[PDB]
Every structure is written in C-alpha cells, then in structure tokens.
Amino acid sequence: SHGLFKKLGIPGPTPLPFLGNILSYHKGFCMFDMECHKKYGKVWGFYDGQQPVLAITDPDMIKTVLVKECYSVFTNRRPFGPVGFMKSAISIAEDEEWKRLRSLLSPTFTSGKLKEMVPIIAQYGDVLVRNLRREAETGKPVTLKDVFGAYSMDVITSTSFGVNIDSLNNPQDPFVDPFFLSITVFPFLIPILEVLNICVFPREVTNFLRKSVKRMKESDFLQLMIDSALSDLELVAQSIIFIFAGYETTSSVLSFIMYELATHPDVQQKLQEEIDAVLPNKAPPTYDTVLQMEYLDMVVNETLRLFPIAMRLERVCKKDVEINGMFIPKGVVVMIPSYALHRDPKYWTEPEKFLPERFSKKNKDNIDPYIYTPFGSGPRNCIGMRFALMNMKLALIRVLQNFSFKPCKETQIPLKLSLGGLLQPEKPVVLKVESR
Amino acid sequence: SHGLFKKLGIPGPTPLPFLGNILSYHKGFCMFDMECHKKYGKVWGFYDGQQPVLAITDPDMIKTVLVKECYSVFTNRRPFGPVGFMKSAISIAEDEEWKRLRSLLSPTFTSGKLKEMVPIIAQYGDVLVRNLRREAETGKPVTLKDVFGAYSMDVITSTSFGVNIDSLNNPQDPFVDPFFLSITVFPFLIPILEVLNICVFPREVTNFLRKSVKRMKESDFLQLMIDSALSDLELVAQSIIFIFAGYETTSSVLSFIMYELATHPDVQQKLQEEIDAVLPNKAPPTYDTVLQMEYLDMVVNETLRLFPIAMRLERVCKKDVEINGMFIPKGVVVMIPSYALHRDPKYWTEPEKFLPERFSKKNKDNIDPYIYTPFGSGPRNCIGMRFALMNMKLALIRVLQNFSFKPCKETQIPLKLSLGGLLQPEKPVVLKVESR
Ligand code: HEM
Ligand code: HEM
C-alpha cells in the first residue's frame, strides 16, 4: 500500500519497499517532522514500514481528531510490539476497555485527591535539599538526572504505594534500535513473540511488582483503586505505566528547566524573587501556593514548548471518514507532530529562543490550544497532567529557595538532543550549584 | 486457554497442548460430534488447537445465536487460512461489510429472478438425458458424480455468466490434510502467507476469471450485479463462491438422492408416479410445477437430513454475553452440530433409516425448525437456498422421467462416507440405469 498517499493527492517522501520512510529517521524523530512540515505544508504522509501515517497541522483538524470524533474514530493509538499481559494498560487498552480504565482511574487524579499528596511529596522536597546540600557543599558539578531521578522515583513509590525510600542514598535495589526497529518494519512478528511469552519489557520484572503488591492487598494511588472491580494482573499492569510515566517525565523536564534557568539568569533571578515573595523566608509550599505563582507556570509552560517529551500524538482511524474536507481510509494512523508545531514561525516568534513572557496572562490568550498540546487533548489526553505539574513545581520551589545554578565547563552550550527517540539531552546536564 | 471450558463448568474431551482436540478427528468430523453429544449431553466444549469451540444443541439457544442476536454478537464465522484477495467474499466478509454484500446480492435470489432461470436450466435437463441416453444404452454402470457434476457445472456457467458448454462432452478445459491442518493448530502463520501472496486456493487461477469477466463488462447472476457499486476484484471474488457452492453442493446431494432412490425402489416408484401425474407424457417442468410436487420435496428434505453437506454451523462470539442462562466469553466460536442433531432419537425415530414420510404435510408440523437446518438460519443463512432446491428438483424430474435406477455389484451397500470433511461418499456412487 505504498501508493495510498499518492492516490489520495497527499504529498510526502517517496517510500522504499518494506522499509518505507524509517531510513529518514537518521536525523531523528523531531528533525524528520520539521523537514516534512517545511517542504510539504499543512498535510503530508509517510510510511513506518508498510503502515501508512498521516500528519496534520491544521488546528481544526487536530481538534476534530482528538476532541470531537474521539470516541467514534480516533479512540486508540497504534499497537506496538509484543505487550504480553500489558495489553490491559490504560494507554495500551483500546475502545470500551479503555473507557472503563479511564473512568475507574479518573478519581485518582482529581482536584481534591491531588491536595492529599501535597504534604507527602513536599517531604521529598526536603530530602532533595539534603542530597543537594551534600553535592553543593562539596563544590563540584552535579548531574541533574540523578538527583531529580531520585526525587521522582521516591515521589512515585510514596504516592503510588507508600514506600518511603531514598533512591539516591540506597542505590542497591531502587527498583527500575535493534529488537524493535525490526518489529516496526515487520509487524507480522508480534504474534509469534506473544505466544512465546516474550515481551518488549524485560518480562522477568513485573512479577516482582505482581508479588510486591501482596502485603498491601491485605492491610496513595494504590489505596484509591482496590477499595471497590479491577483484576490483580490489571492492577499491576496499571501501576507499571504510572511508574514509567512519573519517572522519565518528571526527571527529564526538570533537567530541561534547570538548563534554561542556568543559561538565562534573568529568568532564574525573577523566578527566585517570586518564590521568596509568595513564600517569605523559605516558607513551605502548599497546594494553593503553587497555583498562585504565575511566572513559575510561565517557566514550566515555555520549557514544555521547547521540549515536549511526547513529540507525537497518534490516533488510529477506525473507519472511513472525512474530516474538514479530506478523506482518510481505515487503518491509517493519524499523527500530530507536537514538536514541529511548537517551533513554527506561523504561531511562535523566535521559536528557537526561550522567552517565558509568551505565556504571560496578557500573551496567554493569543496561543492556539491545539498547536500547544504537551499533554494531548480530548478523552485520551494525559490523565496525570495536573499531577505532573504539581510534582515538578513543588520541587522547583524547594530547590530554588536554597540554591542557585550556573553553567559549567562541561555544560553543553548550545544543548543537543538525544539521537534516539527519548527526548533527553545528548549529554547529561551538569551545572554549578551555589548555596544562598 | 485450555482450561476455559473447565473453569466455566462445561464438559468435554481433555485437550492436549497445541493440538487441543484435533486428534479426535481421526474418526471424522461427524463421528466426533455424535460421540460428544452422546456422553456430554446438550452442551460441551473442545479446542481446535488453541481456539475454544462451544457446541450447543438446545433449540432456543440455537434460535438465539442464529436468528435473534445475530447482528449483535453472532455475525461472522471463524477466520480461516490465508484468504488473499478473497477477504471480500460474502461468506468470508464480516460485520457491516457483509451486510452490504448480503443486501447487494439478495435481489439475485428472489422469487421472481429464479423463474427467469427456469427456461435456461431446463435446457441442460435435456442435455443430461442425452449423456444419460448414451451411458444407459451402452448398458453398464455409470458414475453419478461425473454426469451430475457436469450438469451442475453447465448450470453454473449459464446462470452465472451465460456461457453454454457441455462439461461432459468437452473435457479439455471445463474450468475448475497437510498444508492446512498445520494452519488450524498454528493460526499465527496466516499473516505470513498473506504477505507472501500465498492463498489457500490455487492463486494462479482466479486471475483467469479476473480476466474472463472482461468481454461481459463491455457488452444471469452477472448481469444482475454490475448494472448499478461493486468493485472489480470483489465481483470476481463473489463469483468464485457462487461456483464453489453450486458445484459441489448440487453434485453431492443429487448423488445422495439417487443412492436412496436406488436402494428404496418403493420410494423411486412412488416419486416417478407423482412426476408423471403432474407432468403427463414426459411434460416439461416449470417453476410452478416444481413447487407443486410435495413428495419430491419430501424426498429432497429427507436426504438433506441424512447428509447435510454443511455438517456444522459456526458463529464467532463478538462480546461477553449470556444466552438462555449461560455465559460465553469473547472470542469463542459457537458451533451448531447439524449432523448430530439430524440423527438424534430425541427428535427423530429411526435416525439411520430413510423414511420420506417424516416430511409429509401431516408430519412436517412436528419438526423443530432449529434441529433441521440444512441451509442455516437467520441473516447469515444460505443465500442460494431457493436457487439450489429448484436446480436439483428440475434435474430430478427430467432424469426420472426417462430412466430408472438399480444398484450394482460395485454399489456400496451400506454406504460409507468420506474420511475427510467433504460430505461425499467414500467410493463414488455407481448404479445400473435402464430406459423406460
Ligand atoms: C511532564 C509530565 C507529563 C507529560 C508531558 C505527559 C504528556 C502526555 C501526553 C502528550 C499524552 C498523550 C495524550 C494523547 O495521546 O492525547 C499522555 C498520555 C498519558 N499519560 Fe502522561 N504526561 C506526563 C505525566 C504523566 C503522569 C505523571 C502520569 C500518571 C501518573 C501519566 C499518565 C498518562 C496516561 C495513563 C496516558 C494515556 C491516557 C490514555 O491513553 O487515555 N502521565 N501524557
Ligand atoms: C444443496 C445446496 C446448498 C446447501 C445445502 C447450502 C447450505 C448452506 C449452509 C448450511 C450455509 C451456512 C448458513 C449459516 O452459517 O447460517 C450456507 C451459506 C451460504 N451459501 Fe449455501 N447451500 C447450498 C447451495 C448454495 C448455492 C447454490 C449458493 C449460491 C449460488 C450458496 C451460497 C451461499 C452463501 C454465499 C453462503 C454464505 C452466506 C453468508 O455468509 O451470509 N449456497 N449454505
């Protein structure tokens, strides 16, 4: 079906047999979407192997796909690799099976349940200072992904189950393209690996959590789920997605934020002045305190514009439909390039620069909510959106109250992204930390 | 999932790993269903490899599966082998795709369109006498599947497209378990054969018909289809099912009928007296003439009771449902053993005997329409039901008007069925033919 986009009148790169357009991923995932958006315009198509993928940039077509016709056509994402038992994961699940998981897990991410976890995750904000006060008084560059990754991992274990550890102080068992590139080009190898108990995840784990959730089902995220019903294998499958999310997401974004604050001291100083103004004399941050700091929100929102760790938003077309005046055949994965839309002169002035004033209450009104979608949109959006921003800002407040950040001789200026498809820096961010 | 029927409280034979219960098919398809119906009762389950199959015998549960909840749950049959392009076949098609094919092909099998083909198929009733008058005046046993197979094949070509041939007189190009046993046990090999252009059918054919239907689409079943729209590959796919049906079905049933008439001369004499009474002095048969002969219908209906060439009626359970007080999980193929229901003392007296008076207008009322389903039931039933009985009876009238049938020294008495799963005799039926 390599002539589908050419028989529909949709431009795009010429695909190769079997391979399709995956050879154009040598520059990276984001560079491929920006080049295709530059030479093809608002709509183009390419092939991930034999699978056709359609990209859209029009805000009305994106609104129709993600918000309007979500339950009817664009309900699921594309199926990937051997999932093993993980089929029941809310993000892997499809159709009405997901609608039950989305509903049974929606109360866990409410405006009231989030405030319950504020006194818990604020404790690790004090622990992060202790590990910082040790790596700052030692007076030498510090790798941010380790300290932030430890904070995020301890926040996960306490808010998911309630296990209080110090992932940085006890580094003995803190839990935690080849095989799969051939999987995308050869989708007919997925069922064979499923019948052989082979999973993309290291399947020998999971059974740890499958048996770790035993003393808890006899006497946070977990307590607010079993009480009602969810299965035992489902309950472990959902907790694996909650760990994979809150770890790599919170760790990578915080490292991206501290890079911009260290490379723009005018933004870090203005942010530290607002934090000290709302919280005088290193006051503890509360739920209502975080929702008040607007410049802190402007810094978080602008960094997510530059580095949306999702990169892409994918939806599977369930039936032959016609949205906003164009036909889409059944089986085509409709992709929304979030990275390419965030760095486009059509909607952003100086898209390569870091200007937090783009999200000021005066300028936040002239921003299309479907061009800037770091958490997706519609029913299939990020269920842990409000939980993520609260955990990151609570860490940002406690960190900036005691320390400042300056670049180092090893700091990569400018910063280069990873060559893979994790949206992490090429080299781990290292900065100089000084105590106030 | 070899413990599904044991965790639901459903009896059945103990399955083996990978194989399941296919090793119990050494006796045959029909003998396996009759033994399971004898020792397990009204409901049992077995495994065709890793696929669970549930068998039902209750008339209300069969009515619910085939008639009531057909469009909602029991819409499709099980998927079989690499279909290639034949996916679009009305019998292979599934869900709304079939509902369009069933509707676009329904007018071709109406009470009015059938009468148009009566003067056409009555012509080959005269040709069958000529081939009979040759093989009867030669005074020697005649193989019935060859002469009837020639009649059925010429009736197909004339009513489908309009090509008048004599498949018995011109035997030079009259058109027309290993590979697949491993396919049932290993369903994960189907997609690999699809991507290699490999089909269960000899794929090098079809393209003949794909190009044979070229002079007709520029200037019967075919004319009543294109006029409206159906695709070109669909149009050839539907004609292949129409040929496979009207050939093996008409040929095998007619051979089964003439075996019973030759082994029960009291039935053949009574049938010949009714044919000569309705049609005096070898009169030509019409559409209204066939619908009048009731004993001819009693002979055809009783033979279809003994030899229902379908054997099984299969439906795929689309969702978790509960019919008549029992739960059926999603993905289970619900099978209706038509052969076992036809030879059951619960509904039939002397089920091994051939008694045409079971379908008399006095006795036809006390017969459950869901125990006797030679053409299925509901929306997914045989679309060529009324077309089949008209073609067979029109041949039965013209044959019995000129010749009688007696057994031979090679005639297998009693008759043994084939060891495979085609419901044909083990040895081809041969009888002695005499001219009246
Ligand atoms: C900086 C942090 C995060 C970002 C930027 C982010 C972003 C996203 C995005 C873009 C999507 C796809 C939306 C779509 O396809 O329409 C998504 C889905 C999802 N996220 Fe996150 N997320 C973050 C943190 C989290 C956290 C902390 C959790 C859970 C504790 C979480 C759980 C999920 C789930 C379950 C889905 C799939 C929902 C579904 O398929 O219906 N995420 N997220
Ligand atoms: C003695 C002759 C025949 C017998 C006993 C017979 C019997 C059957 C049976 C039992 C079914 C399955 C019903 C079900 O699953 O509910 C079926 C389906 C079907 N038959 Fe026949 N049939 C005969 C002749 C024909 C002819 C002559 C044609 C076409 C010209 C035909 C076309 C079909 C089709 C297309 C289906 C599938 C319908 C669907 O899937 O919706 N059959 N038949």
Query: Tokens at residue A58, please?
Result: 């029009």
Cβ of A6: how many Cβ atoms within 10 Å?
A: 13
Reported structure resolution in angstroms: 2.8
- A394-to-A88, A147, A200, A284 alpha-carbon distances in Å: 32, 15, 34, 9
For the residues of A336-348, what is the DSSP string, one character each? EEHHHHHT-TTT-
CA distance B325 to B42: 13
Whether B191 and A195 lie within 8 Å, measured CB to CB = no
Sign of the CA dihedral running A233, A234, A236, A240: positive
With a CB cutoff of 8 Å and minimum separation 6, the contacts of B139 are none
- B188 interfacial to chain A (CB closer than 8 Å): yes
For A385, how many CA atoms within 13 A lie in the half-sphere containing its CB?
Answer: 16
- B428 interfacial to chain A (CB closer than 8 Å): no
Q: How far is the CA of B425 from the centre of ligand 2 (A)?
A: 20
CA distance A298 to A357: 7
- B229 interfacial to chain A (CB closer than 8 Å): no
With a CB cutoff of 8 Å and minimum separation 6, the contacts of B411 are B259, B262, B429, B430, B431
Which H helix or E strand runs over B144? helix B144-160
Q: How far is the CA of A318 from the centre of ligand 2 (A)?
A: 31
A414 preceded by a cis bond (ω within 30 of 0): yes
Measure the CA angle with vertex B8, ends B5 and B10; round to 5°.
Answer: 55
Nearest CA in chain A to B196: A188
CA distance B92 to B212: 23
Closest ligand 2 atom to residue B91 Cα is: 40
Whether A191 and B192 lie within 8 Å, measured CB to CB = no
For the residues of A154-170, what is the DSSP string, one character each? HHHHHHHT-----TTT-
Which of B87, B190, B195 is the mutation pick for testing A, counting most A CBs within 10 A? Answer: B195
Query: What is the distance in angstroms between the Cα of A189 and the nearest Cα belonging to chain B?
Result: 9
Query: Tokens at residue B86, please?
Result: 């034949």
Instruction: Yes or no: say if A376 and A336 are a contact pair by the CB < 8 Å rule.
Output: no
CA distance B389 to B77: 24
Query: Tokens at residue A83, please?
Result: 């999932």
N residues, chain B: 436
Region of B29 (left: φ > 0; alpha: ψ -120 to 50; beta: rest) is alpha
Q: How far is the CA of B374 from the centre of ligand 2 (A)?
A: 9
Query: What is the distance in angstroms between the Cα of B283 and the nearest Cα belonging to chain A?
Result: 56
Residues with CB under 6 A from ligand 1: A 66, 90-91, 98, 102, 241-242, 245-246, 249, 253, 309-310, 313, 374-377, 380-384, 387-388
Query: Tokens at residue B244, please?
Result: 């496979």
- B79 interfacial to chain A (CB closer than 8 Å): no
CA distance B8 to B12: 11
SS3 assignment, position B313: strand
- Alpha helices of B264-411 — where are they, by DSSP H? 265-278, 287-290, 294-306, 338-342, 385-400
Q: What is the dihedral of CA A360, A365, A367, A368, to 10 degrees?
A: 150
**Among the bound ligands, the one closest to the CA of B94:** 2
Cβ of B106: how many Cβ atoms within 10 Å?
A: 10
Query: Tokens at residue A187, please?
Result: 């989708």
Which residues in chain A have their CB less than 8 angstroms from residue B192's CB?
188
Q: Which residues pair with B45 in a beta bridge?
A: B54
- A79 interfacial to chain B (CB closer than 8 Å): no
Query: Tokens at residue A237, please?
Result: 């499958």
CA distance A86 to A215: 22
Instruction: Yes or no: say if A359 and A301 are a contact pair by the CB < 8 Å rule.
Output: yes
Probe ligand 2: pick from B382, B387, B390, max atoms within 8 Å of CB?
A: B382
Query: Tokens at residue A146, please?
Result: 């380790």
CA distance A337 to A339: 6
- A277 interfacial to chain B (CB closer than 8 Å): no
How large is the C-alpha radius of gyration of chain B? Answer: 22
CA distance B220 to B201: 25
Per-residue burial over B351-381, b = 16 or more CB atoms within 10 Å of its CB, e = otherwise: eeebbbebbeeeeeeeeeebbbbbbbbbebb
Residues with CB under 6 A from ligand 2: B 66, 90-91, 98, 102, 241-242, 245-246, 249, 253, 309-310, 313, 374-377, 380-384, 387-388
Instruction: Yes or no: say if A317 and A332 are a contact pair by the CB < 8 Å rule.
Output: yes
DSSP-assigned letter for residue A46: E
With a CB cutoff of 8 Å and minimum separation 6, the contacts of A127 are A151, A154, A166
B414 preceded by a cis bond (ω within 30 of 0): yes
Which residues in chain B have their CB less than 8 angstroms from residue A195's CB?
188
Cβ of A72: how many Cβ atoms within 10 Å?
A: 10
CA distance A122 to A250: 15
CA distance A310 to A33: 13
Closest Cα to atom 17 of ligand 1:
A382
Closest Cα to atom 3 of ligand 2:
B249
Query: Known binder of ligand: residue A382?
Result: yes
CA distance B172 to B30: 36
Nearest CA in chain A to B195: A188
Whether A192 and B188 lie within 8 Å, measured CB to CB = yes
CA distance B261 to B342: 20
* Position A120, amino acid: I
Instruction: Yes or no: say if A431 and A139 are a contact pair by the CB < 8 Å rule.
Output: no
* Cα-Cα end-to-end distance for chain A: 62
Instruction: Yes or no: say if B302 and B348 are a contact pair by the CB < 8 Å rule.
Output: no
Reference A79, options A69, A94, A68; nearest CA is A94
Which H helix or E strand runs over B36? helix B29-40
Instruction: Yes or no: say if A343 and A371 are a contact pair by the CB < 8 Å rule.
Output: no
Which residues in chain A have their CB less than 8 angstroms from residue B188's CB?
191-192, 195
Q: How far is the CA of A61 from the centre of ligand 1 (A)?
A: 21
- Alpha helices of A138-264 — where are they, by DSSP H? 144-160, 181-185, 190-195, 207-212, 223-226, 232-263
Angle between helices B385-400 and B294-306 (to 10 degrees): 110
Cβ of A36: how many Cβ atoms within 10 Å?
A: 21
* Position A266, amino acid: D
Which residues in chain A have their CB less than 8 angstroms from residue B195's CB?
188
Whether B191 and A192 lie within 8 Å, measured CB to CB = no
CA distance B186 to B195: 17
- B296-to-B270, B272, B316, B393 alpha-carbon distances in Å: 10, 9, 36, 7
CA distance A264 to A272: 13
For A89, how many CA atoms within 13 A lie in the half-sphere containing its CB?
Answer: 21
Residue tagged 């092939």 (tokens): A47
Instruction: Yes or no: say if B189 and B183 are a contact pair by the CB < 8 Å rule.
Output: yes
Residue tagged 């580095």 (tokens): A307
N residues, chain A: 436
Reference B408, options B432, B427, B387; nearest CA is B432
* Position A352, amino acid: E
